[PDB]
Symmetry: C4
Subunit: 381 residues, 4 copies
């Protein structure tokens, strides 16, 4: 987890959402020291447990209700249970990662402090803060609008099914914990995206500095700068591995949630298309599909960018090798090439998969297959 | 995008088809200078928007018609919508790539000018021009014949369904924008194939020159030539990456269109086989399957050839290493081997997939699966 | 197969379960010498043949019985036959591997003796013995409890179907050989896990010793220690290959059994959910799913850990290269880096697949697909 | 294609089966010189065309017959057409490869002559001849027995369906060209297996010679021998590539035929199991499944062995590097290591796939999926 001053707003959002149970104090030097926040540790754990329990309580209440709104049919029951459970698993893994990633967070932020000292020329505090705030605000606004539209649509649907003997509006009101879980999931994804995008952006800054300083006393200082860049690259790779070690299970469950949600939302969209029962429902479902695709991108693109930018330092170093003659500088470039030869740049979600753009292809494949099988069964009866 | 005099006809075809919005002026030296053509930029954007709108207007008109010809049943409606949408997406991505790839086009053509100066011995302007013209003409003739056969078949089908109260021939006439989109797609594929085949052919010429000049003062000039070949190889790799960066989204949507069209056309072929309604329809559908397979090959084979030819320079350089003793020449060959060790040769379609022959296998797998699931559902009812 | 004093209990369990037909005598030095045990060789072969024959005899008896309990319907017959056959194949491959892996066992234990002499500082006999005994005891207790619950559930089910004219309890009693096969399978998995975890743990100990002795006369001895660590790494890789060569077919059939059991148990769980016939049956089936997942992990995690720990020596050696200057020590580190460059660390199950965590993903994919297809067919009729 | 005296019987079998249209004359030195055989070239082409035409003529005759025996139902018609077409495609690709692989055959046999001169110590003419003859004879006997059983079963089935007004035995007699195609396919597979096994066996002999001569004036001769072994390894890799370039399309169509035949034969086995119509049919179908699996192994195992043996020279060379000090010998070993670093050892079937044991896994996956989908559709109606 990256906790820097420009992105401190994302840290506070994650802290209140039970995802970053850390106490941060800003040094007189501008550095943010991080430590365990036992108050917020227990707050995060208790809030997650209570919200998961309330979500499943609302699910059971709807299922056992006189007139269920969402847990009506066996198919609807199964799909809604899966939909809620993937969110529960994703946010539970995220909260667990936040609870048990203090040491990795400290090491990552120390490494990033060193790297940013090395890459001071390419730093932009204003742009970084505004980008982080824009990402957090857009994600939170998107989930807020989507939750509002979903609640309105389901309230209308429950009212259409209302009978004087039973209230179906409270059935919808019992799904508020599920939407709270969705807000926590959005916060977790924003936090992870902030960290991974920071790593990829720093890799790009390192590559740009390399190209500027070697492709655009004095030789000794140049070699010292090349050494600093090599340590920065190695440290950024170790930071990517720290993010993997700390949040790979969260990323894996986010990916599982994304796949399940895409399949389930497309299936419900096509079921309502067959029924042609509520245009507002179709629009809300398409918005949900867009949101799930966008959060899949939010989790996949940062890691793809980080790996791609890390793996393109080899080419710059090869060109420098081809265009260098000083003995000390030539030795430094040879060492950098050796280092980059065996660099593992990809983000791993617990070793189950490598997180990059190829995942999208896999997802597409799976979705198509599952969508084709599910739709045909509905369309051949 | 490669814009050279021998293949200038392909460039003009792509320009009129809204895919190459560039102004080209031939230097007194025979070089083609490229710049933005704002007139043709707006022409391309407006033509694409108008043709997409007209295609979907014709689709809706058929769907809402008194006697739909193609958008008749829910299954037919879905499959026709997908068929049209994949073409729309492919040509829209191609036009977008053409609009926003001027800098990559300029860099690619500068690099190719340098490489062709290096590989002057193996150049064949006459053969290159005739190959490019033959590819463009065969592709355009194939799509023209296929569009004519499709229009005739659908006109006959609409006339067979005609009733005095409504005209079904205008329903067919409203699909002309879709066939225009098909012509644009053919132009885009011909352009991309021209560029990728040029890169693969230049890789092969480089390998042949290497083998001829090292396996078939003076030593200093030989080392200079080896250095020129090494820079040519690196530049061709960067050209492959320029083509990827500029047209990877277009290639990805071409691949998606190919997969969808193969599956959908095979499904309709087998549906009409079950119905046994029109032999001409079956022949036209088999021609469409052949065309979609051939355009899948047109997009996959050039990239496979480029990657394969790029990756076989390592073997020639290894043999030269094994058969060289001069100090300067030995150092040059060692540098070339180092360079080739870390060469990324494959064409990437936006990082989603690597474009080579293995894609065919994947496609086959997917098609088989989808074909098996779809056909069995139709055959078990 | 690893046969060491701390894990000798696992060896005896495997010996009685027909999986380790070896005679072991403890040297005065504490070394365990291993040789062929012809008495236990014939015992293992005969016991496996008799138990497989009795398992299939009980299966046929149930199928041909007046009131079959498990082999009732064609679907139930097929799924039960597959369930029994995967266990039979897994244990038969395990017993065959035990019979024909004496030379590999001897070489592996000699190599491990040398490695443990090298890594004496990080050895923990007490912890190793307690970990091995805990793994064996937990696995045996889990399978015992699961077999007891299964037998009780099936006895109750058979009694519910009992009629005065025929006894269905003997039908359940004829499945005892199948549960004996399950105990043998548990022993085989515990043995393989013990060996693979030993290899991964020794890789980790080697990496820790490297980091401690190089990142935390005298230089000559340090170089000698680095050489010892390099030989230890190469020997551990060869030990991983010995385990692969000896038990890859057993691991492959264990994986096949795991996939088939997960799919079949989930399918029966959902079938009984549709029927809602016996809550105890559902609980037993969920326990079986948990057990099959846990044994899939028991076979996949050790190999993933071994490969991961083997592949992270490259980074330590790279850092040492970056932080070393002595001529002899620098040459030693260069040799170690060369060695690690071309190290094949992954466990291979007969070349069919690489055993690591990605297998889980594959399994999940397959299961989902198969589960989706099977469930939908049941739910659309 | 390998044409050596020990395996000359396989060459003659392939020649008569239209697969090796070459004239071979044995030198006084024992070398076999190969040249184009125009007589046998036209014989091969004409025989293939005639047999394919007769096969499809018999297929159509059965389909159009009064009482079809095999081309009875739409499902049976489709599956039988696919079954015959995969064989036709495999043998047509094999015959085409034989026709257009004279230069590759000559280069491969020259390279093998050189390699066998280098590896004279490990040569065994008697064992090689007996192994080749045993493989050819076992394959031919297996296909002969299977064809006889199939013909007998189908003759009995046709007689059971015979009516006095029409003869169904001639319907079976019209499938003789299909069985002739099967004999040609067996010959092609035996030829390809002979060549690929020769390459893998020579790789193993090279590795054994390396280990014996370096791990079990004088130093100059030892270095010369190491150089000879390095050229032998490079030449064997080029021989593997020659086999790929010449017969990759044949191997690809053999693999496609194997997958289709396994799926189709399993499907027909389960269909007859549902019908329970003829026990002899079930036994013949299981024999066909065994034969198709065994020929899949015959095509997959040789390439897996060749690649595996080629890729294990790196380890021997690394150990020699670690255990060598002579300047010339150390340089020779360094060159060999450099060479092996970038060796592409795998057999490629036209770039579509790499032929090794992982293919089996893929096949299994596909088969399972397809088998599950096909069987469930039959079992849910
Ligand atoms: O299921 C359709 C959509 O509704 C939600 O459950 C929100 O309540 C989303 O998870 C899903 O995208
Ligand atoms: O759908 C069958 C065929 O007809 C087309 O739509 C052309 O109008 C093609 O896209 C397709 O190959
Ligand atoms: O089939 C459900 C479960 O019952 C067993 O067969 C045990 O008898 C297990 O193999 C399986 O997990
Ligand atoms: O189809 C079942 C079997 O019968 C054959 O067609 C032979 O005539 C084989 O190709 C197949 O294995």
């Amino acid at each position: 987890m990256e906790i820097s001053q420009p992105s401190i707003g994302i840290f506070y959002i994650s802290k209140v959402l039970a995802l970053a149970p850390y106490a941060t104090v800003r040094n007189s030097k501008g550095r943010v020291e991080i430590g365990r926040s036992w108050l917020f540790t227990v707050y995060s754990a208790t809030l997650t447990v209570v919200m998961v329990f309330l979500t499943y309580r609302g699910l059971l209440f709807d299922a056992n209700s006189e007139i269920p709104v969402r847990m009506k049919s066996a198919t609807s029951k199964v799909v809604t249970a899966l939909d809620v459970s993937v969110v529960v698993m994703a946010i539970v893994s995220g909260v667990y990662c936040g609870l048990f990633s203090l040491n990795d967070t400290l090491e990552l932020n120390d490494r990033l402090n060193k790297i940013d000292n090395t890459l001071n020329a390419y730093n932009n505090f204003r742009r970084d803060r505004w980008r982080a705030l824009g990402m957090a605000a857009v994600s939170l606004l998107a989930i807020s609008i989507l939750v509002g539209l979903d609640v309105g649509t389901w309230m209308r649907i429950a009212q259409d099914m209302n009978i004087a003997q039973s209230d179906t509006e409270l059935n919808v009101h019992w799904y508020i914990p599920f939407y709270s879980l969705y807000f926590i999931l959005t916060g977790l994804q924003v936090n992870i995206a902030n960290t991974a995008y920071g790593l990829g952006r720093r890799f790009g800054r390192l590559n740009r500095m390399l190209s500027s300083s070697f492709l655009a006393a004095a030789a000794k200082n140049k070699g010292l700068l090349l050494k600093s860049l090599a340590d920065s690259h190695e440290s950024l790779g170790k930071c990517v591995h720290l993010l993997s070690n700390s949040f790979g299970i969260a990323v894996l469950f986010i990916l599982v949630s994304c796949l399940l949600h895409l399949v389930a939302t497309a299936y419900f969209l096509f079921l309502e298309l067959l029924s042609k029962r509520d245009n507002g429902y179709l629009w809300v479902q398409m918005l949900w599909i867009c949101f799930h695709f966008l959060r899949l991108l939010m989790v996949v693109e940062p890691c793809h960018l980080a790996a791609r930018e890390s793996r393109k330092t080899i080419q710059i170093v090869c060109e420098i090798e081809r265009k260098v003659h000083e003995p000390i500088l030539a030795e430094a470039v040879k060492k950098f090439w050796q280092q980059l030869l065996v660099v593992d740049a990809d983000f791993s979600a617990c070793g189950l998969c490598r997180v990059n753009r190829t995942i999208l292809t896999s997802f597409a494949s799976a979705i198509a297959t599952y969508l084709v099988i599910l739709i045909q069964f509905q369309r051949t009866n």
